[PDB]
Design a protein around this ligand. Structure first.
Ligand SMILES: *[C@@H]1O[C@@H](C)[C@@H](O)[C@@H](O[C@@H]2O[C@H](CO)[C@@H](O)[C@H](O)[C@H]2O)[C@@H]1O
Ligand SMILES: *[C@H]1O[C@H](CO)[C@@H](O)[C@H](O)[C@@H]1O
Ligand SMILES: *[C@H]1O[C@H](CO)[C@@H](O)[C@H](O)[C@@H]1O
Length: 52
Protein backbone atom coordinates (compact mmCIF):
# COMPACT_ATOMS: atom_id res chain seq x y z
CA UNK A 1 0.00 0.00 0.00
CA UNK A 2 1.10 3.50 -0.79
CA UNK A 3 1.76 6.27 1.71
CA UNK A 4 0.41 9.81 1.13
CA UNK A 5 1.47 11.97 -1.80
CA UNK A 6 3.76 14.87 -1.05
CA UNK A 7 2.49 18.31 -2.13
CA UNK A 8 2.91 19.18 -5.78
CA UNK A 9 6.02 21.17 -6.59
CA UNK A 10 5.73 24.56 -8.20
CA UNK A 11 5.86 24.63 -11.98
CA UNK A 12 9.47 24.27 -13.08
CA UNK A 13 8.99 27.13 -15.60
CA UNK A 14 7.70 30.54 -14.53
CA UNK A 15 6.49 31.07 -18.07
CA UNK A 16 5.83 28.58 -20.82
CA UNK A 17 5.68 24.80 -20.62
CA UNK A 18 7.12 23.12 -17.53
CA UNK A 19 6.76 20.19 -15.16
CA UNK A 20 5.30 19.79 -11.71
CA UNK A 21 5.80 16.71 -9.59
CA UNK A 22 4.99 14.92 -6.38
CA UNK A 23 6.18 11.70 -4.78
CA UNK A 24 5.11 8.96 -2.40
CA UNK A 25 6.72 6.04 -0.63
CA UNK A 26 5.36 2.67 0.48
CA UNK A 27 3.55 1.99 3.74
CA UNK A 28 5.17 -0.64 5.97
CA UNK A 29 4.53 -4.16 4.69
CA UNK A 30 1.74 -6.20 6.21
CA UNK A 31 1.25 -9.94 6.39
CA UNK A 32 -0.24 -11.07 3.12
CA UNK A 33 0.43 -7.74 1.40
CA UNK A 34 1.22 -7.36 -2.27
CA UNK A 35 4.84 -6.10 -2.24
CA UNK A 36 5.12 -2.35 -2.87
CA UNK A 37 8.17 -1.17 -4.83
CA UNK A 38 8.95 2.40 -3.79
CA UNK A 39 9.36 5.41 -4.28
CA UNK A 40 6.99 6.64 -6.94
CA UNK A 41 6.99 10.01 -8.66
CA UNK A 42 4.09 11.63 -10.52
CA UNK A 43 4.88 14.34 -13.08
CA UNK A 44 2.49 16.47 -15.08
CA UNK A 45 2.56 19.30 -17.52
CA UNK A 46 2.14 22.85 -16.28
CA UNK A 47 2.09 26.32 -17.80
CA UNK A 48 1.52 29.31 -15.50
CA UNK A 49 2.07 32.28 -17.81
CA UNK A 50 2.92 33.28 -21.37
CA UNK A 51 6.53 34.30 -21.74
CA UNK A 52 7.34 37.87 -22.86
C1 LIG B 1 10.11 33.25 -14.24
O1 LIG B 1 9.23 34.34 -14.51
C2 LIG B 1 8.88 34.54 -15.90
C3 LIG B 1 7.91 35.72 -15.98
C4 LIG B 1 10.11 34.77 -16.75
O2 LIG B 1 10.77 36.00 -16.36
C5 LIG B 1 11.08 33.65 -16.47
O3 LIG B 1 12.28 33.97 -17.14
C6 LIG B 1 12.29 33.32 -18.39
O4 LIG B 1 12.19 31.91 -18.16
C7 LIG B 1 12.19 31.21 -19.40
C8 LIG B 1 11.85 29.74 -19.08
O5 LIG B 1 12.71 29.18 -18.07
C9 LIG B 1 13.55 31.40 -20.09
O6 LIG B 1 13.48 30.83 -21.40
C10 LIG B 1 13.87 32.87 -20.31
O7 LIG B 1 15.27 32.93 -20.63
C11 LIG B 1 13.58 33.71 -19.08
O8 LIG B 1 13.51 35.07 -19.50
C12 LIG B 1 11.39 33.47 -15.01
O9 LIG B 1 12.21 32.32 -14.80
C1 LIG C 1 -2.42 11.45 -3.37
O1 LIG C 1 -3.39 11.76 -4.38
C2 LIG C 1 -4.69 12.17 -3.84
C3 LIG C 1 -4.59 13.57 -3.26
O2 LIG C 1 -4.32 14.48 -4.34
C4 LIG C 1 -5.31 11.13 -2.89
O3 LIG C 1 -5.65 9.95 -3.60
C5 LIG C 1 -4.32 10.70 -1.84
O4 LIG C 1 -4.15 11.78 -0.95
C6 LIG C 1 -2.96 10.33 -2.49
O5 LIG C 1 -1.99 10.14 -1.47
C1 LIG D 1 -1.11 19.43 -5.77
O1 LIG D 1 -2.25 19.99 -6.47
C2 LIG D 1 -3.25 20.71 -5.71
C3 LIG D 1 -2.82 22.16 -5.55
O2 LIG D 1 -2.48 22.66 -6.85
C4 LIG D 1 -3.61 20.00 -4.39
O3 LIG D 1 -4.36 18.81 -4.65
C5 LIG D 1 -2.39 19.59 -3.59
O4 LIG D 1 -1.73 20.75 -3.12
C6 LIG D 1 -1.45 18.76 -4.46
O5 LIG D 1 -0.23 18.58 -3.74
Amino acid sequence: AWDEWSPWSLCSSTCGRGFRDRTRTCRPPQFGGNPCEGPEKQTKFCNIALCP
